[PDB]
Amino acid sequence: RAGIVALDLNPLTGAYEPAYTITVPSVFDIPESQRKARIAPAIQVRFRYAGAVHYSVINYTMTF
C-alpha cells in the first residue's frame, strides 16, 4: 500500500506475476530430535522492488 512493492505486473512483458509470495516450510516431517530445540524452521518471502524516476527524455520533432 505504501509503494515499496511492485504492482503485480512483470516488467518484461506486462503480464501477470505475483508481486510477493510467502513460503512456509512443512513441519510434518521434522524429526523429534530437532523438534526439541523449540526453534522453528525458516519462512521465506519474495519481493519486487518498486522503481522511481531520476531522469527524463523528450524529443520535440518539429515539422513546420
Binding site: 504492482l7 503485480d8 505486473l9 506486462g14 503480464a15 501477470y16 505475483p18
Partner: protein, 142 residues
C-alpha cells in the same frame, strides 16, 4: 451413432486452454443464461400488435467448484490479474459430445467472486463470468 444416454463423462468445458475438473455435486454445475429477453410484444388499446427484437447477444455463465480444484487456482489468478489492471478475454467454451449441444464465446471477463467459507465441511465456490457475445452450437444429433 445412436443417441446414447446422457452422462457427465462426455461433457467437455475449456477455460482459456485448460480444462475444468473440480465441480461440485448437483444437477446444476455449469449454467449459462442469456442477457435479456429475445423480444417484446406490445399490444395497443385497439387490439393491434407489434413485436420488437433485441440486438443484445450476450450471456453469463456460473461455474461451481470445490475448494480444491486447479480451475479455482486459475480463476483466482485471473481475478488478481484483472485487479492489477490487465484486461484480456480468456475465451471459454463448453459442449456435450452426445448431442453437440453447448456454446462458445471469444472474450469473457470475471464478473463475480466466491465467498470463502471454512466451516466444518467443504462448501461450494461459485464464479460468475460474462461475455459480450455468445454463440450457441446447433445440436445436430438431436
Amino acid at each position: 451413432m445412436a443417441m446414447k444416454a446422457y452422462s457427465m463423462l462426455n461433457v467437455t468445458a475449456t477455460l482459456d486452454g485448460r480444462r475444468v475438473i473440480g465441480l461440485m455435486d448437483g444437477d446444476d454445475a455449469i449454467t449459462t443464461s442469456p442477457g435479456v429477453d429475445v423480444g417484446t410484444m406490445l399490444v395497443g388499446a385497439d387490439g393491434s400488435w407489434l413485436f420488437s427484437q433485441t440486438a443484445d447477444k450476450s450471456a453469463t455463465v456460473v461455474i461451481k467448484l470445490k475448494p480444491n480444484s486447479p480451475t479455482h487456482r486459475q480463476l483466482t489468478e485471473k481475478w488478481m490479474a484483472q485487479r492489477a489492471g490487465r484486461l484480456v478475454g480468456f475465451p471459454f467454451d463448453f459442449i456435450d459430445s452426445a448431442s453437440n449441444e453447448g456454446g462458445t464465446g471469444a472474450e469473457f471477463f470475471i464478473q463475480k467472486a466466491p465467498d470463502d467459507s471454512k466451516g466444518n465441511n467443504a462448501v461450494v465456490r461459485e464464479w460468475t463470468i460474462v461475455t459480450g457475445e455468445w454463440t450457441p452450437t446447433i445440436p445436430t444429433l438431436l
